[PDB]
Amino acid sequence: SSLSILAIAGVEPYQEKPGEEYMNEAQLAHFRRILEAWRNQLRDEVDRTVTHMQDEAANFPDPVDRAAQEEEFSLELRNRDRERKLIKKIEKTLKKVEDEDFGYCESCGVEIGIRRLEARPTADLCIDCKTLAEIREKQMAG
Amino acid sequence: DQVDYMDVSTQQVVSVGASLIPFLEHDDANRALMGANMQRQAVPTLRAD
Numbered sequence: 001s002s003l004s005i006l007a008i009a010g011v012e013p014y015q016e017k018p019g020e021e022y023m024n025e026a027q028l029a030h031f032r033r034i035l036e037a038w039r040n041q042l043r044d045e046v047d048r049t050v051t052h053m054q055d056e057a058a059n060f061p062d063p064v065d066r067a068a069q070e071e072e073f074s075l076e077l078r079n080r081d082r083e084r085k086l087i088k089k090i091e092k093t094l095k096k097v098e099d100e101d102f103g104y105c106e107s108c109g110v111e112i113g114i115r116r117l118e119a120r121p122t123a124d125l126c127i128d129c130k131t132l133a134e135i136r137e138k139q140m141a142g
Numbered sequence: 143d144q145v146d147y148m149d150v151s152t153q154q155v156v157s158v159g160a161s162l163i164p165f166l167e168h169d170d171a172n173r174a175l176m177g178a179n180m181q182r183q184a185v186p187t188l189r190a191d
């Protein structure tokens with residue numbers, strides 16, 4: 001369905017061949033393409049946002065509609081900030097792919113599933129370590 | 143088979159002042175706010191209708 005992250009690029013889910021080794025040239029190229037498309041899309045969305053923000057902004061004479069026009073901007077900027085935070089993660093993942101050290105958990109040497117990487121291409125840890133770390137985080141935070 | 147309770151009626155969310163405005167469901171929250179605030183300031187006319 002044209003709404004996921006494989007949709008952004010014109011790629012369809014990969015399919016590891018019977019005797020296919022784990023990290024080959026083709027998979028790494030695939031993931032690089034995916035990340036590059038995702039990024040370029042996000043940045044073009046930022047450009048849209050900025051053009052909108054630059055066109056709309058005006059001085060309203062009523063205080064109960066200046067708030068109206070500055071309560072949608074807060075949400076918009078929130079989404080843009082979040083995606084900007086994800087642009088650094090994508091950049092780092094692009095650095096691991098270029099360095100040919102992509103696809104393995106940082107805590108334990110186990111390799112992360114291919115299907116999980118096609119799910120969330122920025123994955124840094126395996127599902128088990130991810131869950132444990134998320135629990136430890138949420139517990140140390142609250 | 144999981145719902146323990148249910149709202150008594152739709153109006154229970156809002157006060158009387160806001161409850162008097164018709165078609166709140168189609169009004170932005172800010173303008174409902176200002177509407178209620180001024181509506182409570184109305185002066186009685188000569189002949190109520």
Ligand SMILES: Nc1nc2c(ncn2[C@@H]2O[C@H](COP(=O)(O)OP(=O)(O)O)[C@@H](OP(=O)(O)OP(=O)(O)O)[C@H]2O)c(=O)[nH]1
Binds near residue numbers: 082083085086089
């Ligand atoms: N649009 C988008 N943004 C993402 C995505 N993934 C992560 N982000 C944003 O980048 C931030 C970095 O997240 P991480 O610290 O790496 O945590 P994570 O491993 O679970 O992704 C996230 O923090 P955060 O705490 O979740 O942000 P927030 O909850 O404080 O708003 C989030 O704001 C994503 O897939 N899509």
Ligand SMILES: [Zn+2]
Binds near residue numbers: 108125126
């Ligand atoms: Zn792990």
